[PDB]
Design a binder for this molecule. Structure first.
Ligand SMILES: NC(=O)c1ccc[n+]([C@@H]2O[C@H](COP(=O)([O-])OP(=O)(O)OC[C@H]3O[C@@H](n4cnc5c(N)ncnc54)[C@H](O)[C@@H]3O)[C@@H](O)[C@H]2O)c1
Ligand SMILES: NC(=O)c1ccc[n+]([C@@H]2O[C@H](COP(=O)([O-])OP(=O)(O)OC[C@H]3O[C@@H](n4cnc5c(N)ncnc54)[C@H](O)[C@@H]3O)[C@@H](O)[C@H]2O)c1
Ligand SMILES: NC(=O)c1ccc[n+]([C@@H]2O[C@H](COP(=O)([O-])OP(=O)(O)OC[C@H]3O[C@@H](n4cnc5c(N)ncnc54)[C@H](O)[C@@H]3O)[C@@H](O)[C@H]2O)c1
Ligand SMILES: NC(=O)c1ccc[n+]([C@@H]2O[C@H](COP(=O)([O-])OP(=O)(O)OC[C@H]3O[C@@H](n4cnc5c(N)ncnc54)[C@H](O)[C@@H]3O)[C@@H](O)[C@H]2O)c1
Ligand SMILES: NC(=O)c1ccc[n+]([C@@H]2O[C@H](COP(=O)([O-])OP(=O)(O)OC[C@H]3O[C@@H](n4cnc5c(N)ncnc54)[C@H](O)[C@@H]3O)[C@@H](O)[C@H]2O)c1
Ligand SMILES: NC(=O)c1ccc[n+]([C@@H]2O[C@H](COP(=O)([O-])OP(=O)(O)OC[C@H]3O[C@@H](n4cnc5c(N)ncnc54)[C@H](O)[C@@H]3O)[C@@H](O)[C@H]2O)c1
Ligand SMILES: COc1ccc(C2=C(O)C(=O)C(c3ccc(OC)cc3)=C(O)C2=O)cc1
Ligand SMILES: COc1ccc(C2=C(O)C(=O)C(c3ccc(OC)cc3)=C(O)C2=O)cc1
Ligand SMILES: COc1ccc(C2=C(O)C(=O)C(c3ccc(OC)cc3)=C(O)C2=O)cc1
Ligand SMILES: [Mg+2]
Ligand SMILES: [Mg+2]
Ligand SMILES: [Mg+2]
Lengths: 552, 553, 552
């Protein structure tokens, strides 16, 4: 398309000093670059050297995210070199810190910004996006960014970082990814007073106009790019998150990772546990600390797993209890019970606990899952009560970051003599016990699911994503534990091999999508594995050398 | 020319969030920016707030040079806002530290790279340069980067930084500035071992090819851009610096800042000292610690300044003495004598000095100038020796960085008890003696000279720069001091006013060029002040809004 | 700058099928062109073949002017191949015919259009012109297009065609040429009723606004491109033409070809004649048929020639009489005498003619010059009266086109036994007389002057063009007649060698410009010939091949 300085200024084309001598000469770059040819390998090492001479995580974020705006293929190469250590940077927890000071660290814009001031003109904006074949859209209003609450347009970092992991893990063409931020104001007074805030100076609009903007946004996106365009909602308010999932679910090809992706990884760990504890599902009793979107999201998907294994809906629900901030979810309590909690709000026992430890002793659960985000509430005695009740208790401490976790690997494994099966939201290191026996805990990271699922949905031209897709993703993830990894005490495969794990998920989800008539991409491929591997985006530089030859 | 995302990837047009609502809508940026209209001020305050979060100078270099590549108008606004503090960052000393690791911090390339491997195809390379009306070239081989020696292609940071100051100070259009690095190899072993070295992995070619390559380079630039294109040689090795300056002085529009710019700023101080103490020029004698590039440069220019005032050639030279690392330069000594030094190699006194303190006592100088870059060799006893020999002694400690300076301001002013006239290369804060008097010493930075001179040479379409230009530039620098500032012991205007000072220098040089028939820009302007002040480049954002207006139906 | 289809769509870069194999491969053109390499020679022949299979002049114009918008270098090559025959097409007379039907034949726009509706916004328009270093501007209001009168914006063809001859003859870089049309309405009712008219539907504005538009236009041009920018006025109303020349002459670097260029070629022929008739200038009496801009233009320049040869102003004026539509210009006549005619309005004789033949017998002129544009008014007996009075009478029939000429070569040479010295505005073929003696008449074409002058003015950064520049151009033109050409009866060199003639004029005018301190381009060149030849624009294709080589 273009030659000269424009090639170097365009991230998609810019190879940097990896432009070969001929490329330089033939594309009019000779002299604009230093007289040295590099490879993507040399360029990558240079990054790792600079990254080592940096302590601050926020400095690492700003550096690496700058590389995206200079050389795209280098950027995604660098993530793929060591994804485990850099995923903390490009996404959580660091992305939170970046999102807090997002107006300070701003350098170059990265996504698409739709305001409530642009009401009725969303189509004009969408059309300004240079890329023509968008497949994956990630959107946020910024109201519920991680644990940091409302951050307005500073939330844009989340879409951006999310889509980095789409490309990095799954192989979704970056040029077909679109991060979107919906600015309708913000209730965060700190930001309104900040003169470097990048959003609108007004409180959140919660009128009809907000709903209308989302409708128009959804329409505008699909008008330009198609109805099969994948649209993921991220870090919306809990109220908005659920009701928008409901009203668009069967209309637009949309999912919510915070609900559905979270449920999937939760379940995938439970299913990993059942390769150890083979107890009939009839026996499993499950107790959630917290009754948030995370709880309800996970709860529903468990019920659906239980249903596919024999149990009814009514019965499977009665095997799930929830203990939130006001106490145990029971019928006829003064504390509020919302519509989504009603199915898990159960007939009260004789003794009605006022403590979580009290509940564990009364209800005799085989599994406790922590999603309160309210610190260390799985007390040492809670851990013990579970070890007395179950021979191998399943304890899931999912809250993030580490400081909000309900308990620690250390705290879990040692207080149950290394019997329990543990998994966490935040990364804990190998625990060592006094008998010289190693236990390597797994991490319940959402990145196990959404990339693979997203690739499959896109590759199959799927138009709606049913809850049973995430159920199939769960089974798919769990089916990649080797025996060794289970012996070591992992309920998830290593994050190190996320790329491979993401693909195999995409494959197994593609098969399911065709088998249940949710794929509209025909002709149907016979070998789904080949079909997926072939279409994943590679970070290797392509030649940009024009073809010169003699005429014989 | 362009619309959409290209306007934001092009730093000459990119206003960032300073794009108005009208501009965003009409240019198709609406939605690509956050919904927040800023101004150049807010953007600037953001930069200032973030600069404080950084502690390392090198972090700051990387952050600020980054802005040149995102937003050019914003970049030069940031420099002009706080020029005094950020000039250390953008250029010396921090550019030295950056130049050392230039390949380790490389993100985007900034200039034009001509290797020896491109011999015969140099015009090809010149023609790849996007800009069509280049007026100012700064070129480096990389052989003698500051006091760091041979950094080779790492030396590119020097031209890049220096042209920032052309623009920042004098208002020379950035799009007409071309930084160039001639790459002929490097003698530095560490770099030849480095897998991130950005140059050719070979020793410096010192053969005939090197000379040919510089010839070809000079021809190629002036072919494309014209013969009056200003070509400034920077940080070449001594041998080459002088010989090329001689070879091209009369053929192209060229100068060397390390020689001629240094001389101008040196002389500017000496003349300002002369204003304080009306010492007859016959009753002056100059002692240089060091007899290299800086010494020889300042020497040759001083001679002219004396000759101008009445002295002859030989007369003025005999008032200038040089003491190098082998000792005092005297006729028929043991250590060798370069031909440029020969004029300042006199017949030995009766007692040949073996140290510098000796020389001060034997020769009884009025002024010592330190350009050896070898630490605190103006020992306390030397400052005292001068303090007793002269009523008002002039002491110039020009060596950089601070650690290689011959003495501090504190050391100079206390051991002379206020009676000293002091200047240095490195910045020394205010010196407050016990008795109550405060002395603010002048910094003898080259940046006083080269911006103003370059601007003048360019606006007058001058084809050659004789040494009298720098002489005339020196007087122009000296003449901007207030009497109050002379009473404060300043021999140089504040760096806070480098802009006002650079323009005023450019004006006076313009008058000189026209008055002495060295200008070729006719018709000749009458008011030279208005001419210069009108052609300076501004950092204020231009509107990119196309004109919408109504036609009678 | 650019590669691919854009190179082929850009006239300045487009070489057509003359793109070499390597160029095609290296610039991404391989496949977009037919598999055949041509030269500019092959491409040129193709043009000449097509031009031969066309009768209509208007078809030839549309074809060749299309080539300018496809391949610029080919276009100017083709003019330089046979300039003599094609100059009739690109300019007069055909350009007149094209200008009449300009809205019909419109295909692609060619110049810059400034309307009175764009009052106060002329700078915006000027800035829309893509070219950055304009040197030669030709502008028209369209009020007095050739003989066709007011044609409004259809007059744009004139600037365009004029500037074709700038490039074709002189070598003025086409990219530095700017044709401008000032639309202020038109009095031509035929055009106002035409629904394909390309100008404004209103009568000519003759208020202050017109004058103001011209001021702003002049300012805007010079603001962007400089005060030394050459601005030529063409085919303005006679009133406007003179007064605009006067008020801007010493302000903007401006000339008018219809006045000054016309005067120059007139004089150059008179000076050619004086190499035959060596009579002292004191004896020369001159009589103009018509007292138009052409008459007055020529008259003044003659006076200035006479002055440089010894005569005073008052005396030199008395040697010039004028006979216009109302009769002989005499003091105290009922017919109007304008300010410019006053110097040539003389003390009445005893007998005051009412016929032009009557005047020739009374006043005894040695030279008659026809610029009435009113047909054959040099009656056969006029021709004879001149032959009886003078041994070699100088008869100049300058009116155009041929039908408006005052007499013919045939009519002139035979009615004076082949004694007279004749020149015409329109081309007449070699006359043959009954004694087997050939007389080849010259043409008083303005193209002899303005290209050479224009090149010199531009190359010398001249800021004002004095009348004595055109006087020097005249002497320069005449100094290129060989003796043979004078023997044959030519008062001008062949149009065939206009390119060479234009350059030599530019050289001699450059020398004069430096010698009289009108050049601001220093350093001054020592050899003016080399200086000019070096800087003329060539039509040869340049290589567009990027430099590829090995690294030794
Ligand atoms: N660069 C190329 O050579 C190129 C590029 C695109 C398509 N094609 C050709 O077109 C055929 C059909 O391609 P298609 O795109 O219409 O359908 P497809 O069968 O190749 O892909 C199905 C769907 O998945 C999307 N998709 C595929 N890979 C993706 C990725 N890495 N990231 C995001 N979205 C991705 C496509 O846009 C499409 O909507 C291909 O089989 C190939 O022959 C070639
Ligand atoms: N590991 C993962 O993949 C993953 C994914 C999503 C969310 N999470 C984590 O889940 C946690 C909850 O997120 P959420 O979106 O459900 O938030 P939420 O506000 O919707 O849920 C919080 C719930 O905890 C309850 N609670 C608060 N303090 C309590 C206390 N002291 N005792 C008992 N109950 C208490 C609240 O009443 C509420 O029911 C967070 O810490 C978040 O980091 C983890
Ligand atoms: N302040 C300014 O504007 C400015 C401008 C240019 C140069 N300088 C300074 O000038 C200094 C020298 O630069 P240069 O290019 O002339 O270097 P150079 O290598 O050309 O000259 C060094 C000279 O010092 C002599 N020398 C070295 N050690 C000595 C010692 N111990 N005692 C006596 N003489 C000794 C050497 O023999 C030689 O003659 C540097 O420190 C540099 O910072 C300052
Ligand atoms: N061209 C037009 O001509 C007039 C001026 O002509 P000109 O462009 O030759 O300039 P000029 O005649 O005003 O100045 C003469 C020279 O100065 C240069 N120059 C002016 N400002 C400069 C700057 N800020 N940085 C670097 N070089 C600078 C020019 O390129 C030229 O070489 C203006 O009207 C302009 O738009
Ligand atoms: N393509 C090239 O290589 C190229 C192009 C332009 C200039 N140059 C270099 O710049 C030097 C100075 O060029 P300059 O233009 O400033 O001055 P110049 O001395 O070459 O020309 C003087 C003036 O005439 C104009 N001019 C020259 N040739 C012309 C033409 N054919 N048509 C119209 N206008 C014409 C110029 O624009 C200028 O205003 C040249 O001597 C050359 O070294 C090179
Ligand atoms: N050969 C050239 O280079 C050249 C250049 C310019 C104009 N011309 C020709 O000159 C002629 C006049 O052009 P102009 O611009 O001076 O027009 P104009 O209207 O200014 O001049 C016409 C003059 O002829 C007079 N006239 C008209 N009919 C007459 C008659 N029957 N008897 C006597 N006088 C009569 C008018 O009164 C007026 O004085 C045109 O035919 C034009 O083609 C030739
Ligand atoms: C309301 O309190 C919350 C709720 C959810 C979160 C999230 C997480 O705890 C995640 O781990 C999380 C997440 C982390 C990693 C990941 O793949 C890299 C995907 C999601 C989120 O998106 C969250 O919103 C944080 C605080
Ligand atoms: C040989 O040792 C040297 C020689 C010269 C130098 C230079 C300086 O000491 C400068 O101050 C210097 C300089 C510094 C600032 C400036 O304007 C900001 C211009 C020149 C140079 O270019 C040098 O080369 C340093 C060490
Ligand atoms: C008013 O009647 C007129 C006046 C002038 C003309 C012109 C000519 O007769 C030209 O020859 C003429 C011209 C012709 C050729 C040329 O070089 C090719 C330059 C001018 C004009 O520009 C005229 O305006 C025509 C009719
Ligand atoms: Mg989230
Ligand atoms: Mg230097
Ligand atoms: Mg005309």
């Amino acid at each position: 398309k273009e030659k000269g300085k424009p090639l170097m200024l365009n991230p998609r084309t810019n190879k940097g000093m990896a432009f070969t001598l001929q490329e330089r000469q033939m594309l009019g770059l000779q002299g604009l670059l230093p007289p040295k040819i590099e490879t993507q390998d040399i360029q990558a090492l240079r990054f790792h050297r600079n990254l080592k001479k940096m302590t601050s995580p926020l400095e690492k974020y700003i550096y690496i995210m700058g590389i995206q705006e200079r050389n795209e293929k280098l950027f995604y190469r660098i993530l793929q070199d060591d994804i485990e250590s850099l995923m903390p940077i490009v996404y959580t927890p660091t992305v939170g810190l970046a999102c807090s000071q997002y107006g300070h660290i701003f350098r170059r814009p990265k996504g698409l910004f739709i305001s409530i001031s642009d009401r009725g003109h969303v189509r004009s904006i969408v059309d300004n996006w240079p890329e023509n074949h968008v497949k994956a859209v990630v959107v946020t209003d910024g109201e519920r960014i991680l644990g940091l609450g409302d951050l307005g347009v500073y939330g844009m970092g989340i879409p951006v970082g999310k889509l980095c992991l789409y490309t990095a893990c799954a192989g979704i063409r970056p040029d077909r990814c679109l991060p979107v931020c919906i600015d309708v104001g913000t209730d965060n007074i700190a930001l309104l007073k900040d003169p470097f805030y990048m959003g609108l100076y007004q409180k959140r609009d919660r009128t009809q106009q907000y709903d209308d903007l989302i409708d128009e946004f959804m329409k505008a996106i699909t008008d330009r790019y198609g109805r099969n365009t994948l649209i993921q909602f991220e870090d919306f308010g809990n109220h908005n998150a659920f009701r928008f999932l409901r009203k668009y679910r069967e209309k637009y090809c949309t999912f919510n990772d915070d609900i559905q992706g979270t449920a999937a990884v939760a379940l995938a760990g439970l299913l990993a546990a059942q390769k150890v504890i083979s107890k009939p599902i009839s026996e499993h009793k499950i107790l959630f600390l917290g009754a948030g979107e995370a709880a309800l999201g996970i709860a529903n998907l468990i019920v659906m797993s239980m249903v596919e294994n024999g149990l009814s809906e009514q019965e499977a629900q009665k095997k799930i209890w929830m203990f939130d901030k006001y106490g145990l979810l029971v019928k006829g309590r003064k504390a509020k019970i919302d519509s989504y909690q009603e199915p898990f709000t159960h007939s009260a026992p004789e003794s009605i606990p006022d403590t979580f430890e009290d509940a564990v002793n009364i209800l005799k659960p085989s599994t406790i899952i922590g999603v309160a985000g309210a610190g260390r509430l799985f007390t040492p005695d809670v851990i013990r009560a579970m070890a007395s009740i179950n021979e191998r208790p399943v304890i899931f401490a999912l809250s993030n970051p580490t400081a909000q976790a309900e308990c620690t690997a250390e705290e879990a494994y040692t207080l149950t003599e290394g019997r329990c099966l543990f998994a966490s939201g935040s990364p804990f290191g190998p625990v060592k016990l006094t008998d010289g026996r190693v236990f390597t805990p797994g991490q319940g990271n959402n990145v196990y699911i959404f990339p693979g699922v997203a690739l499959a949905v896109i590759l199959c031209n799927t138009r709606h994503i049913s809850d049973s897709v995430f159920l199939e993703a769960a089974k798919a993830l769990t089916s990649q534990l080797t025996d060794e990894e289970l012996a070591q005490g992992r309920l998830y495969p290593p994050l190190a091999n996320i790329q491979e794990v993401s693909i195999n998920i995409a494959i197994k989800v593609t098969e399911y999508l065709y088998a249940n008539k949710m794929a509209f991409r025909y002709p149907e491929p016979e070998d789904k594995a080949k079909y997926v591997k072939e279409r994943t985006w590679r970070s290797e530089y392509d030649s940009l050398l024009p073809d010169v030859y003699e005429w014989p």
